[PDB]
Amino acid sequence: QIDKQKIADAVKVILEAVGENPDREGLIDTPMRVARMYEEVFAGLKKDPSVHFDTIFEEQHEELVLVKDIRFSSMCEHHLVPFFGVAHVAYLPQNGRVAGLSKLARVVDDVSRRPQLQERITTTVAEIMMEKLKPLGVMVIMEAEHMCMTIRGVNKPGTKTITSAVRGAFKNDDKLRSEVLALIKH
Amino acid sequence: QIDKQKIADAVKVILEAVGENPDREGLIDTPMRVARMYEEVFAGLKKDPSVHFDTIFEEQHEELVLVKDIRFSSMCEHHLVPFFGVAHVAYLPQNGRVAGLSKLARVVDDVSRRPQLQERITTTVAEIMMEKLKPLGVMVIMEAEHMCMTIRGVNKPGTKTITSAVRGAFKNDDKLRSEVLALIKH
Amino acid sequence: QIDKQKIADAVKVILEAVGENPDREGLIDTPMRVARMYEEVFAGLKKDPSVHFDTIFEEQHEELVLVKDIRFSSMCEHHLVPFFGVAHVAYLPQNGRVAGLSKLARVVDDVSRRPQLQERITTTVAEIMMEKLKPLGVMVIMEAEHMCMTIRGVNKPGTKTITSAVRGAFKNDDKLRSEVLALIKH
Amino acid sequence: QIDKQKIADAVKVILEAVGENPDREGLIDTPMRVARMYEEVFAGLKKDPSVHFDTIFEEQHEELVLVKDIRFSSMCEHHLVPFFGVAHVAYLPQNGRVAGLSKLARVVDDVSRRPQLQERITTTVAEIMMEKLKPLGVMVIMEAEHMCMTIRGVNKPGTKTITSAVRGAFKNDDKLRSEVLALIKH
Amino acid sequence: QIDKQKIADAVKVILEAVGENPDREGLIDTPMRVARMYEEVFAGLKKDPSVHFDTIFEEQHEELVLVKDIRFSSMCEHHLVPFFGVAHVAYLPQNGRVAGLSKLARVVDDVSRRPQLQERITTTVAEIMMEKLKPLGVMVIMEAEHMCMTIRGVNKPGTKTITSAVRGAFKNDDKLRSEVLALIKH
Amino acid sequence: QIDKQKIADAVKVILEAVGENPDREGLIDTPMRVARMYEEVFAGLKKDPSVHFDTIFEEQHEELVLVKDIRFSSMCEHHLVPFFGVAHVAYLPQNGRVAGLSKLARVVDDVSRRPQLQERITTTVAEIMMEKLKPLGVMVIMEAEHMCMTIRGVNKPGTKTITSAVRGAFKNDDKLRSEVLALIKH
Amino acid sequence: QIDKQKIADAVKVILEAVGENPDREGLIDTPMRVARMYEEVFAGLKKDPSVHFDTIFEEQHEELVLVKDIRFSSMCEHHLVPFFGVAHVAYLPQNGRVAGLSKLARVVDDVSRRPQLQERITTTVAEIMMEKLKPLGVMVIMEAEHMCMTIRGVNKPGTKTITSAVRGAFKNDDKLRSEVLALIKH
Amino acid sequence: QIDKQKIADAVKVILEAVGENPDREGLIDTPMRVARMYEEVFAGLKKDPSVHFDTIFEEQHEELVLVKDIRFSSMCEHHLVPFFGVAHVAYLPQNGRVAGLSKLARVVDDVSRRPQLQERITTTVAEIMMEKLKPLGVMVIMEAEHMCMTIRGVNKPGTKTITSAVRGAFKNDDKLRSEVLALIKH
Amino acid sequence: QIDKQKIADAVKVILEAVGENPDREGLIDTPMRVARMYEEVFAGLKKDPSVHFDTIFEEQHEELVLVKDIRFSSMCEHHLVPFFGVAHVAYLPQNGRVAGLSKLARVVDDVSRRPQLQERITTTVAEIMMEKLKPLGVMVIMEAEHMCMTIRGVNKPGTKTITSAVRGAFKNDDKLRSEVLALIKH
Amino acid sequence: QIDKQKIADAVKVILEAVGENPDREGLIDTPMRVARMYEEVFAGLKKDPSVHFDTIFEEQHEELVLVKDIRFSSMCEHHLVPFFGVAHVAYLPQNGRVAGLSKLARVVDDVSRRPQLQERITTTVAEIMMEKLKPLGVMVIMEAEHMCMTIRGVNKPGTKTITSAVRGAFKNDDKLRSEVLALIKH
Incomplete structure (x- = not known):
């Protein structure tokens, strides 16, 4: 309260x-x-x-899953002004442990709903997934515009910040990272 | 201070x-x-x-001038959160009293740099132009996205608010208003 | 309950x-x-x-306000399947009575959160605005895709249904309606 | 019945x-x-x-065939609400066994016309192809928006889920997967 | 048979x-x-x-309804080769008689499923609506590409044929026609 | 005759x-x-x-030539209905045996002007080029929409089929194939 | 010869x-x-x-027909270099006299296949249609790029020339001209 | 010199x-x-x-000619920094006097190649055409970005200035102005 | 003379x-x-x-420079009809030898201003850059439309020809070629 | 002073x-x-x-950060005329040393506010970031249009110059460079 x-x-x-x-x-x-x-x-x-992610998981499945264009918003901790954009979350399930989509989105929201750095949201979401889902790997990408930057003296509207976090198999397998990036473009 | x-x-x-x-x-x-x-x-x-506008130029021109896609940002007075977008300003000079483009932009900025309603920015800019430029007419249109709306419970990203103010000749000449609107489309 | x-x-x-x-x-x-x-x-x-709309702001403002691309969704009453798209709401304030943007969106949502016809959502939103804002006029346009039609027998994906409701000044002033329509295109 | x-x-x-x-x-x-x-x-x-696929054409063609942007829709088994988007199906024919395009589409439709998970549609299509077409390999990608997610409390419109299934030669040849992904972008 | x-x-x-x-x-x-x-x-x-028709519900609703981008295809009666594109159907309900949206689409399909001229499909759809809905007016527009033209000696790919039919109020009210045309652009 | x-x-x-x-x-x-x-x-x-190609021009140029977006149409041999789209042809010349651009287009047209499979058009063009031009390699990509699929019960408008054929150096050099694909996107 | x-x-x-x-x-x-x-x-x-146009189709249809984006090319008579683009032809049939689409295109081609001015092609096509179709009116618009201007002298690539000719009802009915122009802009 | x-x-x-x-x-x-x-x-x-300005006579060349997207650049006389964009020039020939298209472009260039105001370039081009072509009317529109504004303290990149000049028939005929504006959009 | x-x-x-x-x-x-x-x-x-071709000297600068979308036009030596489009030139300076942008463009123009093959323009520009800049490598890509092909019997408007020439490091480094291609897409 | x-x-x-x-x-x-x-x-x-460079310390954050589409402008040192466009800056933080986004933009502006070569701005920004952030690597890309080239005799509007600088890990890791390029396109 x-x-x-x-x-x-x-x-x-x-x-x-x-x-x-x-x-x-x-x-x-x-x-x-x-x-x-x-x-x-x-x-x-x-x-x-x-x-x-303390929940029953989805029916077993062994291939890449990517959820893209998940809207989020947050507030820069430096200035307490909004930044907003999309998150893309990809991962390689292990032993069929798959995340409910709405659960994923709730994690992103919950991590977001506090004063933040985009970088910390990105890695935290990746860490939570490694902890709770224990997948072969995760890749998280976030893309956002910061008002910290659009409304202030610096005045650079249209600037996008893009952060990424790779864990597990995505850390070592460039072909996999590359496939994710191709699927995110569309 | x-x-x-x-x-x-x-x-x-x-x-x-x-x-x-x-x-x-x-x-x-x-x-x-x-x-x-x-x-x-x-x-x-x-x-x-x-x-x-305490400096205006004297060259003799009477036809429509439109400055479009002037970026601006401000803070909603209701929630003290940024809203941002573009202003379009059109006027019919007379006696060749023409506004410097950077002076126009400064007016938009100065009016914007306080807690605002988009409506009030729109009309104020229009009033200042009528007072200082004494043109045959002015038309101001603003288009913006409000974070008041994107980050809060209501959660409607992509919503645009559009305001307008017409004075002088633009108030009684619908053809003229219409031409401005066509030129703003792009 | x-x-x-x-x-x-x-x-x-x-x-x-x-x-x-x-x-x-x-x-x-x-x-x-x-x-x-x-x-x-x-x-x-x-x-x-x-x-x-039980809480409204009093400003000295008399010109067109348009809120466009307000996302909504609802369920067709015929088949109980979602339809979704955007609502555009324009009004001419009277005596400076202006609607909070989020209040507008809430009305759209609340009217939408029941089995519906798009036509009825459109008129109901318009009626509520006339009743509670007492503006000079209102114009509501909705644009949506119906799954009633994309998944089912007719199988026509991409079909958009567009409904409108005009009240007050918008009912008699075609120029005004026309300007709203131009502003909605962009 | x-x-x-x-x-x-x-x-x-x-x-x-x-x-x-x-x-x-x-x-x-x-x-x-x-x-x-x-x-x-x-x-x-x-x-x-x-x-x-009980009817298959035998013409000695051994190269990549991709059918992309096949519209599909289904109902999530969790909420019985539609999800919809596109399927892309690529395969390397073997001994000139080529699928009729409309037969491909029918398989997608038939697998889809039941309560589903996107993941299961993806792999089922891929399996049916391997079994009935006996190609050197198949790659199936599906991209969809879930109303499960757009209309509910979570409220994340625009979120796209992307699933994939690779079999045969696509499982081991990253260059081939990569070429499919490039051809799907356009 | x-x-x-x-x-x-x-x-x-x-x-x-x-x-x-x-x-x-x-x-x-x-x-x-x-x-x-x-x-x-x-x-x-x-x-x-x-x-x-008429799946007609009673609403008390008198304003414009437009269903746009209804995909259709047919065969030219001159060459028995397909032409295809979209139909747009607008009407002004009378006495609250509203058409089911899918019923509209079925009419377009049924009229289309025979050797045709685009012109005849357009007027026939308009006539059927006047007969069965008894609205204040209807406007039908169709836009299509003819293979009659793309594959033959003339060889003009990208050529679009656009037909229209207006009845009732749309015949006499140019402002109304104009509004429909604006809403169809987008 | x-x-x-x-x-x-x-x-x-x-x-x-x-x-x-x-x-x-x-x-x-x-x-x-x-x-x-x-x-x-x-x-x-x-x-x-x-x-x-009983006609060739000796220039001593050895580098990639790509002719893209060559319109074609043909008739599916399964249903005798048109399919149409573009062909892209790339090759690595050998000894000044560069193909006249119009001669290329004529080959595509001629191969196309009979009941066909898109796959067969693709390989046949590639084979003719290897035979007549004797280049270091050829790559042919075709992209088309089939009415076989847009007008019939299956009803999937917007589906594109993409075929390819690689010979010579393109068969073994994935970087080269990749470069062609990039150049075809634009 | x-x-x-x-x-x-x-x-x-x-x-x-x-x-x-x-x-x-x-x-x-x-x-x-x-x-x-x-x-x-x-x-x-x-x-x-x-x-x-020595062959006309008879069916009693009296409403607007527009054929748009008819590709053409010609040679400027000033410099004998190509200009090319599209023609749009609209007419109001009289007594059901309708032009075959391919016949229309042939007229545009035949008028074009000689040293020309764009202006003359435009009026000639319009005149031929009034003579041979005897419609209530015709409107012809052409849009083209002139190499006369891209390669030589002005060196202004991207410049488009737009010509028009109106006859009959289109000459006096500005609403009609307007509707054509809207239908051409999609 | x-x-x-x-x-x-x-x-x-x-x-x-x-x-x-x-x-x-x-x-x-x-x-x-x-x-x-x-x-x-x-x-x-x-x-x-x-x-x-030399003309040639064409018959029933009384109708509108528009040359659009003529690239131009100039230097603001206030700061001696470039501004650049496009000019659109429309006229109604009189007595079949047609301008060479390249001559038009040259006039724009020549008027531009000196320290300028956009307004003055616009009217001068219009005046020269009235004087030398003696058409029924002329309409000139220019659209440009000013570095005067993008690089300086005011810092508003993306801002476009739009000027217009109408003479003769375009001054009194709004329908005609309107048609020009529609043709310029595309 | x-x-x-x-x-x-x-x-x-x-x-x-x-x-x-x-x-x-x-x-x-x-x-x-x-x-x-x-x-x-x-x-x-x-x-x-x-x-x-003069070079500019920036001491020690060794990284990739790409100048893209350089408009050019030329005349096919086979038919003396224009072809036109863009050239992209990329190079790896050596020891800080850099090319003035306008000098680059002039080379392209000068090589172009004679009856040509696109291929020969491409290689010649590449050679001249190796000679006059002595860079670590050069890559030249040209993209053009040929009227040789749009206006003649073959009649294939929209066909683009793409040529390339690589020298030095670009010949053996596929990653580098690839990066250039990615930067050219945008 | x-x-x-x-x-x-x-x-x-x-x-x-x-x-x-x-x-x-x-x-x-x-x-x-x-x-x-x-x-x-x-x-x-x-x-x-x-x-x-007031860096910020976040924990141990070590993953890719990309700030893209940072607007900048400068004056060519050769002609003292503006060039402008965007900068993209990517880096791999080391030991959680992260740059404030507005600080990054200020560096770009400050380096830019003097007569420049685009190449020197690019490298200088990269060097400053290596010095002050000590990251594992940096990649800077700039894309700009030069008026040096648009307004002068050479007259090539639309030409873009693209420069890059890679340091540290980006110099040796082509996969990483490639991923940055993909994220910049997007």
Whole structure:
């Protein structure tokens, strides 16, 4: 349970401090709206994201699985402004241990819903999968645009950041990485 | 000069309140970074945006000028989260009073650099142009994506908001409005 | 409070009736999953979708607002299979009554979360807006693909259905309707 | 022969249970429509999909054949909601045994017309080909969007699942797999 | 029931006449395959396409409905070679009479499944809708590529033929036609 | 010389057999039109397609030549319905035996102008080039859509079939094949 | 019959005059090749292009027919270098007089196969249609790129020239012209 | 003839003044290179842009001619930095006076080859055409990107400026302007 | 110096020989226009293309440089009709010898401005770069459309010819060739 | 602090020398505007671009990070005219040393804000990243259009120059380079 009233009070202080009128009609509810938003976008601070893979797995299957264009969003920890884009998750199941698709997506969301670095989301999702799924390998790629960069002095809209994490077989098998990348293009 | 320290204190309170560890390496400078960011993105609170048109050029031309796909960003006043996209600005000069292209962009930026509604940015830019350029008419269209919407519970990425403001000749000449809209399509 | 157990029993009957083995591993949890899904996608049956506009902002703004590409999904009432696409909502505020963007999206979602016709979603959204925003006018357009049609006998993938509802000023002002349509193309 | 009446009764129970009015005009025929739909989309439960290859053409051609962007749809067995996209099927004929294109498509359709996992459709198609075509190798790739995921709480529209099955020469020849993937991009 | 054997005999004659060897492996079954194909693509000769309407529900709904990008194919009556593309069907319901979307598609198919002129398919579909739906108006547009043209001496691949039929209100209201055309672009 | 009258008679029989009125205005000339069309599209039955290379130009150039997006059409031998698309031809010349571009196209056309399998067109073009040009290697890729599949019960519009044939150096040099494939994407 | 030898002698003179060696291997046959090419591309000098409409189809159809993206090429009369692109032809049939598609294309080709101005091709095609089809109106649009301009003098590759001719109803009905233009833009 | 040496001396002074080393390898030849560049890009200062408009008579060449996507570049007179894009020129011939297409392009180039405002290039081109062609009307549109704006502090890459000039019939006939705009979109 | 009058006399002979009226208004100046055109497009016959190739010196720079999408045009030596498209030039500088961009383009133009084969342009540009830059290697790719093929009997518009030449390191390093190809796609 | 007056005097001399009237309204302030512009775009002459590298430490993160489509602009040192496009920067962090994204962009800008060669910007950025981040390797690619080439006699708009620099692991690992290139295309 987040203390929304405490956050709201801080937001009000911020608004006064930047030279705004916190009592004007457009801002009256902003403090609480910001609080509610933080509650939602930082909910992952209160959750172990690995729990979604504590579940019964899907019917046995032994070949590459790739789930691509999984939308995500997060907040840069440096500036607390959103960054957003897609994640692509590929892996080689071992002994038929396959992840429910919606569980995958929940991991990405849960890891994301806290102040982050894209790099840390990428590796964490890869680590959780290695831990919980014990596959022959995993490859995670994330692609995102950072407002940290679009709205600020630097002002570079259209810049995409791309992170990747390879574990297990994907670390040593370039042909496999290469196939994943080809399948992700389309 | 805004009180950055005061803002930083409030941000720290927010980080504790959401359940984060404000002393961890990735957050230690976040309070001050957010304060410096707010100083930059809300600088417009301290500026008259109309000053950029205190220099206008006198060459004699009476026909339509459209500047399209001017990038902008701002922060929704409801949630203090960025929205960003493009502005298109069209006007009918008279007495050859023409706006420098960079001056136009500065007006858009200055109006934008405060907590805003897209609607209000749109009309303000239009009003400033009527006041300072005294053209036969102006038409302003803005197109933007709101993170207010993409990162929150509602979760609708790809939603675009489009606003417009017409003044002078554009208000009564539908053919003219129509031509502008065709030229903006591209 | 939906009787999920009852639904699950009916689903199990359906699975037997189509010639499946409801006791096979891949189907054992299907009855309850379907029940939980129905609870979610038909939640709108228990909600008044108009409540989201019980809070409205007063600004001094009188010009066109268009929110386009709002993703939605629903279930055809004929076949209980999903249809999905986008809604575009345009309105002319009256007396500065402006809708929060997220409130708009919520209305679309809530109206959508029940067995539907696309036509009815379109008009209902429009009606709710006229009633709760009291704008000069509203125009709602929806564009969607129906699985009723992609998977089933007609087998016409790629077919899009487009519905519209105009009220108030949009009903009588063809120029205005025309401008909305141009802005929606881009 | 499916017991449609039994299904229709169960659907009526479901409609009552979710809080709908089964007697309203839009729903009166829904129970039977759903029954007829299930009879069609699950027809594959009554068919051997391998019969379509009981006719094969013998012309000494030994090189790669790829049939790409074969539309398919199916119903997830977990939620009985459609998933749909494209299948790509590549094979290396052996002794000039070539598949009729329409026979290929029929196999995909027939395997699909039952409650499924994408993975199982992929491998089943591949197995049927190896068995009935006896080619040097087969590669099957499927790309699909699951409504299981777009309409439910998880709410991740745009997410694509990609499955693959390689047999014979495609299992050991990475260059060949690579060429197929290039030809599928375009 | 058509006389497939008769057709097969004629096809065999055609194959001998063009200098082919009707006994070679690739052609042995061609006569009967062509017969079965004609039975399917010319099935409309045995059917009344008007029987599919009206699946008319009552809504209280008076606004435009457009179903676009309905795939169709037919055979030119001049050369018995396929032409194919899309149909777009728009109407203004009267007294809340709405057409099932799939019923619309079936009408297009049925009218199409016979030797045709694109022009005739277009008007026939429009007439059937006026007769059976009794709407305020209908507009039908078809867009297609003719192999009559792509494979023959003239050899103009990429040529599209576009036909239209307007009835009722669409005949007199250019604004309405115009809106339909805008919605069909996209 | 083809016996057009004999073909026309057979076409008339086919029209009666399918339940059409052969004497209606749109069909009266169809029998002879179809005969003249068959004369044209099956002209290749009377031609040696290799004669176009009884002509070569000695330049002493040894590097890759690729002619891409050569339009072709043909008739499936299984159903006598058109298929059409593009051919790409690449080769490594040897001793100034470069092929005139129009001579290449003529070979494709000539091989195509008879009842065919896409596979056979692909290999035949490749064989003719090896025989007549004696290059270090050849690679032929064809991409086409089959009406065999778009207009019939299977009904899969947008399906493309891709065939290839490699000879000489292209058979052993995967890097070379790969480069060709890259150059064909653009 | 044209005097190819005379042309070949003139071409040889041209080659000498520009400082080329007419006896080198690549040019030996060029004079006769250019003669044969001129015989083909200027064949329209010997043909009445109107004869293709001496056969008309009668069916009582009165609505708009548009044939778009008809490829053509011609030679500028100013420089004898090719220009090429597409023609779009729209007409309103009168008393059911409809043009065969291939006949239309032939007219465009025949008018084109002589030294031309794009403007003249456009009006000539329109005039022939009014004369031979006696429709309520015709609209012809041509779009082309001129090598007159890409290789020589302006050196402006990508420049398109667009010409139009309206007759009959299209001359007076701007809504109709407008609809044609919309249908051409897809 | 320009005094290049004088320009080169001034450029060298500029390089010293900005803190650069004019003797370093990369700058040694820069002063003369800048001089030669100015000679080329400002050559229009020494020419009468036209100055060269000869026409030919064609019959019922009274209809619209549009030359679109004419590439141009120029230098802003405010900053002496390039701007570039396309010009579109449309006119209604009078009495069959047609412009050579390349002559049009030359006029654009020549007017462009001097320090400019986009507005002035636009009107000048329009005026020259009215004076020298005496058409019923002319419409000129230019679309360009200004480096004045992409490289400087304002920093707005992607911004396009669009100017237009209408004379004669285009000034009073909105339908005509509209048709031009539609044809320019494609 | 070219003898333009001699060429003009030969062109006039050609025009009479093809059955044209050389005294009609559109053709009166054509002989001289064609002469002036040949003077321009064959100017390379009088020029050494290597002579203006100057290098730029960047000390120690050794990494890949690619200049892509360099427009060129030329005339096929077989038919004297234009072909045009793009050249891509990649090289590995040695010891910091780098090519000025405009110098590169000039070499391409100069080699092109004579009757050519695409292959010969390709290798010649490669050779000149080995000679004048002495790089570690060069790769040249050209992509063009030939009117030799679009306007003639063969009639295959859209056909692209692609040539390549590799020297030095690009000859033995397939990875490097591959990277160039990837960079050219975009 | 650069001597703006000196620069302004030189610019005035340049304007006279090219044949312009420096006293005309549009040019009066140009000299000083150019001076102020040079002060801004060449500000990098006074800064060390390596100072911005405040790396961030994330844990032990060792996997690929790519920041792509970073907009940049600079001035060619040869002609002092802008070139602009994108930079892509990829690196393999060592010991968790990661670069702030905005810091990366600042380095690109600072290196760019001086007369440059694209090649030198590319290597300098790469060097700075090796020095300051000490990663396992870096790859920098830049893609730009040069006005040096678009506005001048050579006149080749659309030409892109692509430069690269590889250090550390990217120098020896072609698979890695290849993966970066794929991710940049995407």
